[PDB]
Amino acid sequence: PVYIPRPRPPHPRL
Amino acid sequence: MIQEQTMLNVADNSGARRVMCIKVLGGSHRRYAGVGDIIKITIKEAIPRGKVKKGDVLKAVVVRTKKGVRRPDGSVIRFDGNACVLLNNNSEQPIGTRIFGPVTRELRSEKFMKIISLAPEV
Amino acid sequence: AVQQNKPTRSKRGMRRSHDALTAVTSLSVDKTSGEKHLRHHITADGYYRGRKVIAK
Amino acid sequence: RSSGAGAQHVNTTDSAIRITHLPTGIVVECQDERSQHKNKAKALSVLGARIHAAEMAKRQQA
Amino acid sequence: MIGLVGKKVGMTRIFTEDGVSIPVTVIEVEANRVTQVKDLANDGYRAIQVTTGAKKANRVTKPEAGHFAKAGVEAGRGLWEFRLAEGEEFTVGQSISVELFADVKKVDVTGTSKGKGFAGTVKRWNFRTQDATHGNSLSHRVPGSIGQNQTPGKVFKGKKMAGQMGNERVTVQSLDVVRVDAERNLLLVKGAVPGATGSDLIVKPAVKA
Amino acid sequence: MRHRKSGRQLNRNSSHRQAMFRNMAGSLVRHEIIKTTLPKAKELRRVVEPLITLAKTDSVANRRLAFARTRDNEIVAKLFNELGPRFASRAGGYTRILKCGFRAGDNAPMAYIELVDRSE
Amino acid sequence: SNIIKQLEQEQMKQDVPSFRPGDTVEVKVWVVEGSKKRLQAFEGVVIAIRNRGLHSAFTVRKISNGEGVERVFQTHSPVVDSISVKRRGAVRKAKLYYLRERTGKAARIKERLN
RNA sequence: AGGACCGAACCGACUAAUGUCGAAAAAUUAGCGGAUGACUUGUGGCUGGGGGUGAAAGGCCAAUCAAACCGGGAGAUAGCU
RNA sequence: ACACAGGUGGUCAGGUAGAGAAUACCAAGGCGCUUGAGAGAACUCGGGUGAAGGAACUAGGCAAAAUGGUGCCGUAACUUC
RNA sequence: AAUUCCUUGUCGGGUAAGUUCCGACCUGCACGAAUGGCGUAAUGAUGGCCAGGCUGUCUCCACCCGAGACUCAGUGAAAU
RNA sequence: CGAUGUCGGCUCAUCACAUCCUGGGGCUGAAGUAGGUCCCAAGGGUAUGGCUGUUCGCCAUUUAAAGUGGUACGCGAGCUGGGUUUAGAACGUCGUGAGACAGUUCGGUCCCUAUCUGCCGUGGGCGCUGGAGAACUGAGGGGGGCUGCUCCUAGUACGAGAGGACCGGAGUGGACGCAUCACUGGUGUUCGGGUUGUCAUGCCAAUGGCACUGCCCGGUAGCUAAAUGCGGAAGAGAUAAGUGCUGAAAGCAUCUAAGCACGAAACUUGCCCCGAGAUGAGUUCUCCCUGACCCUUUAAGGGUCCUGAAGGAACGUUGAAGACGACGACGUUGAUAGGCCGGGUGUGUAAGCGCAGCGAUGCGUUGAGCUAACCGGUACUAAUGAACCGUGAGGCUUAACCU
């Protein structure tokens, strides 16, 4: 593909 | 069918007008009361000339239900309003000297003799 | 949803073992014409139980 | 477990101690630091101070 | 003693003279004739297998026709079997009517329950349905958790989940008898029995005497 | 679980279902034979037979009750004059179903639904 | 079935007075007060009739002292004894459940006098 | 007369749901706030990268912004995988 | 990126009911939205109703439920009147 | 108190019962007068609490209507 | 650290006893009740609201009790996101400042269509060997096992009085689970009626379409509980704690060393359900199959004609059976489904006509008309005559029985 998107944020876990 | 947070009218002239059923007494994990079961109430509204004040937490007995009580012949008796009679917390012995409205025959058992004696109908 | 590893050819065959279609193999013979048809169905020309039921 | 904020530490934790002294009815609540022992010492010092203050107040009233 | 096979035809109520109206079920009882008497010399247990009803002479198969001609009785629907209680002995072909229910006071009715189909968790095992608001997405009538964590690593056998409800062989026990009618061949029982109108019912005497 | 229920839903709401039963019963009265799917014919057996049952006796109000259904004057005109005195002797069951293969568009069970007619 | 109908028809009483819903019906019913057997009275307005043959019943709504008292009565039950119609009400609806919210002047209805 | 009130076009997205490999890389459904002005929009120009612009969020600058993209130093460098 | 539930400026614009370009049904006109047929399981969505209680549910009256229009009577504390 | 650690500091009201709220007590870790203080009519898809009506939110769910989910015919993926 | 989602809450639970109650006992500083402590016993149950995001805690009221812990302080490919930890902004403090604060408070997108094990169910093939139709026995496994209050005993024993038994029996309750619409209700967009706005049938009347089923009012059958019954046991065996009898070692004593009799909701039964895939594949009854041949590696071999038997399968009518399979009833020798007649129920005096009224409207025919899923009949229609699978009596060895 020409455009690979930003992934989905993850569990905070900070 | 009288359960928790249910507003009831007072049947006798003890002084309160609107009460709130806070717990159905008798048996744990019980949903609702029956014909003449004991419930615990708080007082939300009273007259100035009442023998009890607003805020007294005390025991009462249901006398009229909108759900209806069942005679063993197959019939049901549905009243147009919930009603209770106030009782003095260790010996029942109701406060009011005159009681308005009719009662049910299954209330007549060994401890509510004054209520059915003062009952004008049934 | 997402698998750990792929299944086999053997797993696919044992899965598709019950996907085998069943033929009826019970074609009937009309009384008048004798054409092949199914159970409780009319023929291509409209024959059923000998009577011309379609009238067309 | 403690109320307040800033760390998971809080989540896996405890780090909050309440000590009640039965014959007087004095409750000491400590939620200061991350560790129990350093709060255990503060809770015992507050128990000693409150019991000594409640006894000396009764003595000064008498 | 032995039980009898009957058909459920509706439910009614009986008005007693004192005022109490009791709900009753009308169980009709046909001629429960004996087909075979099994003995300990060939099976190791004494019992009797019987039938009821009446079949047409096109549906009954030649094995069942030979099994019925072994007894010589008329062909009837179904076959049931009752264990003997060592105090009596029945012969082959004895027309057992409802007169055995005249002495007993309480009976036990076993019937095929009415099939509810593939029912959910809330309908079958009476689970509490979760809150339908305050952010609830796609989790209204689901059972939720079905196992603990990594350390069990599996769902325990016997877990109360969604599945088949009905078509069981349930038994409502200790049902009172009301009236034993011999002219109409009926058996009024007190209360409700499993099954709809037209289902088979095994009415045995009460084992909890 | 629909224990002892009748009435086929046919993947439609009651308005479209009643409207297409109206139109299909009118087409079956007008053309005397039509070709449709099998459960539509099975439920149309519960629609056309009360229409003929109402059309058994000719009067003033029966024309208005037969005009309340099928919403057409030519359909009720073919009723009570042509179907009425011709289906007088037979009592009920005036229809006939003929299973005719499957449709090549969606593989649905096909059926000619007709009346007991066409001896003209 | 014929069995259920035969079991019901032998128990139904054959002297049921016919009354339309809305009639001011006075019903006298037996009651057992222990060692007493008293025929008590109950006079009110019929607001519903549920015909089920032997299982048939009828409501009699009564405005007693204070609030209203609604009580059903089984027709073929032995606990009731007499049904006497006092006034013939001229409502045109089978059920009269709308009369529950109406008290006082709005509770009364039309007389038939046909 | 009103940076007036309710409420359509229009502008924006406050709650909940549907979606969340969706009808679509921000949407729809049922309710919303403004709707004669500090409003919205079409057309055509001007301001541009250590800069432009900003009723000010360090936002936006072609779906990418605490320093855009393209091409070249450059095969930068990397005790690191 | 698609024969995509998104966006796109200006003009004409009727009948009944309606204060109204709202909303309900229609005329002129265009369409049935390029998968259908069955059965009516658990579960999911948009909904409708419900005995008795009326927020006891929940972090939280969140969501749902309820009021809602014209004419008339009357309208409290406070106030920059 | 958007301030406050000790603290759910103390009194009263509201509720049967209130770590929230209101009016205060000042013992102000560590308020404070243009990085403005105290009040303030009207206003706010603003934070919190209470009162009435109203209801499936709940007690305790039950049924029904359409769209999927189940089957058949045709086309036919994806993360891994 | 080329990713293991953590607190608290809702639902769902599982296990240990260091047992909260119920149960069986010992001591007591146990007159009885109510107690203190200890042992065995996990079979069952083990709160409702305010505050706080809070687990916890306090309060109010029950209860017989408001048990402790593990299971990633259980459970986010079951659910929110209140709090803790993204980006905005503020109060107080520190730092000249940018900024920081286990010091708050305001607000802030929580993805996934199930490949494998597991679980809930439901099917096909094959096996048990000649096959089929049924009926069960039964290994083994699963469900449940809670108890309050009142009365009799009995105001009895005990106790100066007050108070108040143990054991046993009966009734009525709460929760749980099962069953069913007989009663009462809810739903019942397939039944009837009222009404608003519009349109159509050339117009009145009447009816139909849309506007959430237009708004509602009820309401047939089914489903459902709030409605009604049922059950937790009684009894037996072996016991834990404990109480014992006889009884030596050890002239006594001793519940134990030999033995015997008691002794709990704990164990097995007894109550109910699944179940011979229990490959150990069980037992009984019945039905059906008794026709010739060649080749030959004379092998429990292969091939041809004739017959298809009991039974099963396919199709259709279908169901208070069901996702699909499967199960039940029927297929013309018929009441399985649809239609029709009558009854019942529900809505409630249809349309037309006649009369009164200027009119809306009112009355009589009429308590009519219409009736879905109900009941009892009626072949009126549709389930056709047939074709398909399944066979020529069934292997070896040994013993007892008749020849």
XYZ file of C-alpha atoms (C1' of nucleotides) in Angstrom, chain E residues 8 11-13 23 36 38 42-43 45 49 56 58-59 61-64 66-67 70 79-81 83 106 113-118 123-128 130 134-137 139 142-146 148-152 154-159 161-165 169-175 192-197 207-208, chain K residues 10-14 71-75 78-81 112 117-122 131-138 141-144 176-183 222-225 228-233 270-274 282-288 310-312 320-323 325-327 329-335:
160
model
C -52.466 -34.618 29.806
C -55.896 -27.980 33.283
C -58.974 -26.933 35.277
C -59.850 -26.063 38.872
C -55.929 -25.833 40.460
C -44.513 -58.450 29.308
C -39.741 -59.575 33.220
C -33.751 -64.076 32.630
C -32.969 -60.426 33.479
C -34.826 -57.964 38.110
C -43.573 -53.392 30.621
C -53.705 -47.915 13.520
C -50.531 -49.431 9.119
C -48.032 -47.670 11.389
C -44.072 -52.472 12.433
C -43.761 -56.243 12.128
C -41.278 -56.485 15.073
C -43.729 -54.483 17.198
C -44.888 -59.756 16.767
C -44.040 -58.344 20.203
C -46.633 -62.405 21.949
C -43.939 -48.840 25.718
C -43.093 -48.127 29.357
C -41.670 -50.264 32.152
C -40.325 -52.044 38.607
C -49.728 -38.322 46.918
C -40.845 -30.858 29.573
C -42.008 -28.298 27.034
C -39.074 -27.534 24.743
C -37.867 -23.954 25.096
C -35.154 -24.409 22.466
C -31.712 -22.857 22.396
C -33.573 -17.579 30.696
C -31.981 -20.918 31.612
C -29.856 -20.437 34.746
C -31.592 -17.235 36.015
C -28.509 -15.017 35.781
C -28.759 -11.323 36.582
C -26.199 -6.442 33.545
C -23.995 4.029 31.801
C -21.725 3.091 28.909
C -22.811 -0.516 28.316
C -21.765 -1.559 24.801
C -22.669 -6.566 26.939
C -24.012 -11.897 27.889
C -22.909 -14.130 30.810
C -19.637 -12.214 31.144
C -16.822 -14.109 32.817
C -16.762 -17.892 32.325
C -10.798 -17.175 36.202
C -7.369 -16.611 34.626
C -4.115 -18.262 33.412
C -3.780 -20.484 36.504
C -6.940 -22.544 35.822
C -9.803 -23.604 31.240
C -13.544 -23.476 31.829
C -14.697 -25.875 34.549
C -16.960 -28.763 33.571
C -20.527 -28.124 34.677
C -20.466 -24.398 33.891
C -24.083 -21.411 30.265
C -26.541 -20.887 27.425
C -27.860 -23.939 25.630
C -30.740 -26.368 25.342
C -33.729 -25.646 27.584
C -37.483 -35.726 31.686
C -38.201 -33.575 34.746
C -40.327 -34.778 37.666
C -42.558 -32.598 39.829
C -42.824 -34.646 43.016
C -45.347 -34.974 45.855
C -48.512 -33.956 43.995
C -49.074 -28.295 37.617
C -47.323 -31.149 35.818
C -44.565 -30.886 33.169
C -45.592 -31.066 29.539
C -48.252 -29.556 27.309
C -51.700 -30.844 26.395
C -41.519 -42.411 47.032
C -41.325 -39.728 49.763
C -21.278 -4.758 37.564
C -21.984 -10.076 35.986
C -19.856 -14.886 36.525
C -17.539 -17.844 39.925
C -13.691 -21.866 41.891
C -7.063 -17.986 41.908
C -1.806 -12.151 37.399
C -4.641 -8.954 45.622
C -9.658 -13.829 39.933
C -12.367 -12.034 35.849
C -17.043 -10.224 29.274
C -18.455 -4.037 30.186
C -17.630 1.158 31.668
C -13.449 4.818 32.775
C -10.211 -7.232 17.187
C -7.348 -26.401 24.146
C -11.764 -25.658 27.375
C -17.111 -25.062 28.296
C -22.633 -25.019 26.905
C -25.520 -27.779 23.543
C -26.715 -30.364 19.010
C -29.436 -56.770 10.200
C -33.509 -53.951 12.196
C -37.655 -52.198 15.602
C -38.285 -51.252 20.665
C -38.061 -52.015 26.119
C -34.842 -51.476 30.129
C -30.811 -53.211 34.007
C -26.642 -50.639 35.006
C -21.092 -38.873 36.092
C -24.271 -34.565 37.182
C -28.411 -31.391 40.078
C -30.124 -30.358 45.213
C -32.957 -20.875 45.871
C -34.281 -24.235 41.807
C -38.016 -26.890 38.915
C -42.828 -27.098 36.598
C -47.355 -24.708 34.343
C -50.991 -20.581 32.414
C -55.923 -23.421 36.462
C -56.420 -17.726 38.942
C -48.783 -18.687 22.844
C -44.285 -16.682 26.177
C -43.650 -14.680 30.981
C -43.541 -13.763 36.140
C -49.838 -21.291 41.740
C -47.783 -25.986 43.431
C -43.344 -28.879 44.348
C -38.389 -29.984 47.100
C -34.239 -29.545 50.558
C -36.020 -34.514 54.056
C -31.722 -43.349 49.842
C -34.767 -37.912 46.075
C -34.260 -36.614 40.722
C -31.564 -36.428 35.713
C -27.869 -38.177 31.717
C -24.623 -55.382 28.561
C -29.768 -58.123 29.086
C -34.857 -59.399 27.128
C -38.794 -59.679 23.305
C -40.026 -59.622 18.188
C -39.455 -59.393 12.848
C -36.837 -60.822 8.255
C -37.780 -56.962 7.961
C -36.343 -52.177 8.240
C -34.062 -47.535 7.105
C -46.878 -26.530 22.537
C -39.884 -30.410 18.497
C -36.308 -27.248 16.358
C -30.402 -22.007 14.457
C -29.237 -31.290 11.763
C -32.037 -34.447 14.992
C -37.116 -35.891 17.473
C -47.716 -37.260 14.038
C -49.550 -38.265 9.058
C -49.303 -39.529 3.563
C -55.662 -41.269 0.984
C -56.922 -48.211 4.526
C -56.527 -40.012 6.287
C -57.943 -35.815 10.700
